[PDB]
């Protein structure tokens, strides 16, 4: 026996059933270019995650509203959606979970929030800043564009202390240019 054999792992996306549907290809490319995604895989995993959330809500809604499992897990699901900024305190019902869309999840990405908070010039500029270790969520540097920000953490997005844009020393391009200028 190897202990490592007991480590779990799973899949995070499914490919479309119809690969060459022109309507779908048009809608997906619009979301990919709007949010600066790397490929269709990034959009497919968000759809995969959304399907899981909606499926959980549908099962709960099919039970009696007095069912203890309906009450307990329903509150947990609503609490989870509120903590990430998907739902509002005025939408505290499982029926509002079924009304969520892919755009709601893509708007909570770190890449989207870095752009819509003014830190970046374009959605594609935010992508490079995140992966280049210029952003931090609170005290922690985050270099994953797919990081899903929480409502309690959205106000702490700032430049990293080690970045040239956050108080750190200038990068190696300016430093070399300064060195060359000094040599003159």
């Amino acid at each position: 026996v190897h202990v490592s054999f007991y480590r779990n792992y799973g899949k995070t996306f499914k490919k479309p059933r119809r690969p060459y549907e022109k309507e779908r290809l048009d809608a997906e490319l619009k979301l990919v270019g709007e949010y600066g995604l790397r490929c269709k895989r990034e959009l497919w995993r968000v759809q995969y995650a959304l399907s899981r959330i909606r499926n959980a809500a549908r099962m709960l809604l099919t039970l009696d509203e007095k069912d203890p499992r309906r009450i307990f897990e329903g509150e947990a699901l609503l609490r989870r959606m509120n903590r990430y900024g998907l739902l509002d305190e005025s939408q505290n019902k499982l029926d509002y979970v079924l009304a969520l869309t892919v755009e709601n999840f893509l708007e909570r990405r770190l890449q989207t929030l870095v752009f819509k908070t003014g830190m970046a010039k374009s959605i594609h500029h935010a992508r490079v800043l995140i992966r280049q270790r210029h952003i931090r969520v609170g005290r922690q540097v985050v270099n994953v564009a797919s990081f899903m920000v929480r409502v309690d953490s959205q106000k702490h997005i700032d430049f990293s202390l080690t970045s040239p844009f956050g108080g750190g020393r200038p990068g190696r391009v300016k430093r070399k240019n300064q060195k060359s200028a000094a040599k003159k």
């Binding site: 490592s4 007991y6 480590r7 203890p68």
Partner: protein, 261 residues
């Protein structure tokens, strides 16, 4: 197999030990002793996983080989010694003394005791019969044998055992109206008042227990352990006092704690 198995695979260990599945291929194989291997807590788990005194398997051996740990008043040096329900664990250097009791979620809890309360324990009587020379004796569910017991003691009763004199100080008859704890099954760790006894000839006897909050649950006679006469237990219980809360109620407390804490 051609004989006795000496290994316990980690995933086959009892769940109430709460061992991490990636911590290794093996779990401590409980030694033979007063308690069954599935209803015990080996000293290695207690010293390393519960109390954190030892950081590794090796350090538990060092602690025990210095004769610093006692179970039921006697020093124990076996790492996998099966300490079980109602056992008293004492560590003189740290001046600590615990009683192994189940929490309401069915897991062993090291309930800190006072020096006065650490001088006895409760045992459940298994049977009473005549031994050699017609001398009556009783044996318990913790492997103990007591000769010349009180003639009033019968099977399923509870006896108060003094760990110094090693004698029966007092006993409780098994009857409806006493406070009992569940020691096995789904309701393990729950405390209530024995309300009814349903006997079925040739089959297991069912006992209906009612919680202090009116919640009623059933179980088998073999999983019941009388704690006191009437409604007051003879031993100190943990904070929950055997009250099992619903997940909704438990979530309510957690939410309130974050608001205050």
């Amino acid at each position: 197999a051609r004989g006795l198995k000496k290994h316990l695979k980690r995933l086959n260990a009892p769940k109430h030990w709460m061992l991490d599945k990636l911590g290794g291929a093996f779990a401590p194989k409980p030694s033979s002793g007063p308690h069954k291997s599935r209803e015990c807590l080996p000293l290695v788990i207690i010293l390393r996983n519960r109390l954190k005194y030892a950081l590794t398997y090796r350090e538990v051996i060092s602690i025990l080989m210095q004769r610093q740990v006692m179970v039921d008043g006697k020093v124990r040096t076996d790492k996998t010694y099966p300490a079980g329900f109602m056992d008293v664990v004492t560590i003189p250097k740290t001046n600590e003394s615990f009683r192994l009791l189940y929490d309401t979620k069915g897991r062993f809890r090291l309930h800190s005791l006072r020096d006065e309360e650490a001088k006895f324990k409760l045992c459940k009587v298994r049977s009473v019969q005549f031994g050699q020379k017609g001398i009556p004796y009783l044996n318990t569910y913790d492997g103990r044998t007591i000769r010349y017991p009180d003639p009033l003691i019968k099977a399923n009763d509870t006896i108060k055992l003094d760990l110094d004199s090693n004698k029966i100080v007092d006993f409780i008859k098994f009857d409806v109206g006493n406070v009992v704890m569940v020691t096995g099954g789904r309701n393990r760790g729950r405390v209530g008042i024995l309300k009814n006894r349903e006997k079925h000839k040739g089959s297991f006897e069912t006992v209906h227990i009612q919680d202090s909050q009116g919640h009623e649950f059933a179980t088998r006679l073999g999983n019941v352990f009388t704690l006191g006469k009437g409604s007051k237990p003879w031993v100190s219980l943990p904070k929950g006092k055997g009250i099992k809360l619903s997940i909704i109620e438990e979530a309510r407390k957690r939410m309130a704690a974050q608001s205050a804490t």
